[PDB]
């Protein structure tokens, strides 16, 4: 059996190290990788370390451990909520902006704490651990999880045992995402995780610096999937104790807060060396305490946080645009973009909340549709730099003609992107209404629905802007500034 896992992981490492076989066969590659991972998983015994008690049986030890090290432990309790899972619930009225939660650095798991642990020797030798702090945190979790006397045991024993990241999806649940933007990141996540597991499985067996690790005796795919999912759904960027650099950290107790819409109210206090959270809003006794995770899209929430957020005012879709080398005005357009700090080709974003395009995308689209005369005015003369400075400003167009052209292009491109999906918006709503689905299936279908709804709104907003600027052109309105 040990030699059989070596053969399967070696086969997995080679299949996952191969280049992409073209986007037309990425689903076949995904299923091929799934088959080998599931064969390895069926031959392994799941998580190497499991705890006898229930998850809530260890929360009192988390509170005692956090209290002994200076963290806030009063005013809230752990509750298993249906929608979000476990989270914090207020036991007293908490006013907005009240500093109610603080976690000193001594409780955190960091890349620095990983470097000084039993993972130290292997960390100083493996180039992937040195370059990827998130992967370093994942192995930091695993090594301490398998260490019964670890300082962070109260935190690890209260972590979830499974997640709703796409790594846990069934094949037919991912299949809903066919022909979407997000599935390619799902493909990459699965392939990367499989390649990393096979890579480190071989590294741990061949490197003498890993002999003292518990992973030397047991390191299953389930371990790695749980570790990277624990990190991607919970990790944070904090300043170093010096304050001159940034590092990645797991923040116990505080990271039990679930997400709602708002503003980030959690910051690191460098003078007291602790993470501080003020109340995002008023929380009455008996209400769940929420925080705002960040301005991430539902694609990022699903893939990296394992949930879909219905009230995501920061949702967005990607749109790749670039000046064609076949364009007669390519050189001038690329130079105007260069002077504006914009690459010639890039992946932009289309947002659901108006305005649909950012200042950087507006500036790109303006230059993309400029005439030679307009490009010259942004390249030559004492006003050229002033014209560059306003390229991202909606109130200062290059010309009414330039606006009509760019909004017509965006309307056509967004409408073309909508035609590349295998289902329509009405079909997705019918599936959600008429079929009984798992949580993970609903995440996938809502994700593909959300992509098209953002594209549909971009079509409507671009069509509206096209008519507005066409009116200014027909009425010969004076250009602003």
């Amino acid at each position: 059996s040990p030699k059989e896992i070596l053969n399967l992981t070696s086969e997995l490492l080679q299949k996952c190290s191969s280049p992409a076989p073209g986007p037309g066969k990425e689903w076949e590659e995904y299923v091929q990788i799934r088959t080998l991972v599931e064969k390895i998983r069926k031959k392994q015994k799941g998580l190497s370390v499991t705890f006898d008690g229930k998850r809530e049986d260890y929360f009192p030890d988390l509170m005692k451990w956090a209290s002994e090290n200076g963290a806030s432990v009063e005013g809230f309790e752990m509750v298993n909520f249906k929608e979000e899972g476990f989270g914090l619930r207020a036991t007293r009225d908490i006013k907005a902006e009240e500093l109610f939660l603080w976690v000193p650095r001594k409780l955190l798991m960091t890349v620095e704490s990983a470097k000084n642990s039993v993972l130290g020797p292997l960390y100083s030798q493996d180039r992937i651990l040195q370059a990827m702090g998130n992967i370093a945190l994942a192995f930091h979790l695993l090594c301490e999880r398998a260490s019964p006397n670890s300082f962070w045991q109260p935190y690890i024993q209260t972590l979830p045992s499974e997640y709703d990241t796409p790594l846990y999806f069934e094949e037919d649940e991912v299949r809903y995402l066919q022909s979407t933007q997000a599935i390619h990141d799902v493909f990459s996540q699965y392939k990367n995780t499989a390649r990393q597991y096979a890579y480190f499985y071989k590294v741990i067996q061949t490197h003498p610096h890993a002999n003292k690790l518990p992973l030397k005796d047991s390191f299953t795919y389930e371990d790695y999937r749980w570790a990277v999912s624990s990190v991607m759904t919970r990790q944070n960027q904090i300043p170093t104790e010096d304050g001159s650099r940034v590092t990645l950290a797991l923040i116990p107790l505080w990271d039990m807060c679930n997400h709602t819409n708002g503003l980030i109210t959690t910051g690191y206090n460098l003078e007291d060396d602790r993470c501080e959270c003020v109340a995002l809003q008023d929380f009455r006794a008996g209400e769940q305490i929420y925080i705002f995770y960040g301005t991430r899209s539902n694609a990022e929430f699903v893939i990296h946080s394992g949930f879909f957020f219905d009230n995501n005012s920061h949702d967005r879709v990607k749109i790749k645009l670039g000046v064609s080398k076949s364009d007669r005005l390519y050189a001038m357009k690329a130079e105007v973009l260069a002077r504006a700090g914009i690459p010639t080709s890039s992946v932009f974003a289309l947002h659901f909340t108006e305005p649909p395009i950012s200042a950087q995308l507006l500036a790109f689209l303006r230059v993309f549709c400029m005439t030679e005369e307009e490009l010259k005015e942004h390249l030559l003369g004492d006003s050229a730099i002033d014209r560059i400075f306003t390229l991202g400003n909606s109130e200062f167009p290059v010309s009414w003609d330039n606006e009509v052209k760019l909004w017509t292009f965006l309307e056509d491109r967004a409408s073309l992107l909508l035609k590349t999906y295998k289902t329509t918006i009405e079909e997705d709503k019918s599936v959600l209404k008429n079929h009984d689905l798992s949580v993970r299936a609903k995440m996938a279908i809502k994700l593909r629905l959300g992509e098209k709804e953002i594209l549909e709104k971009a079509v409507k907003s671009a069509a509206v802007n096209r008519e507005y600027y066409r009116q200014q052109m027909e009425e010969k309105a004076p250009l602003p500034k």
Binding site: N134, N236, I238, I251, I264, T266, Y293
Partner: peptide, 15 residues
């Protein structure tokens, strides 16, 4: 504003 805002589950590169 917050000198060091903390983003819960900040997205990192795994490639």
């Amino acid at each position: 504003t917050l000198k060091y805002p903390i983003e819960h589950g900040i997205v990192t590169n795994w490639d």
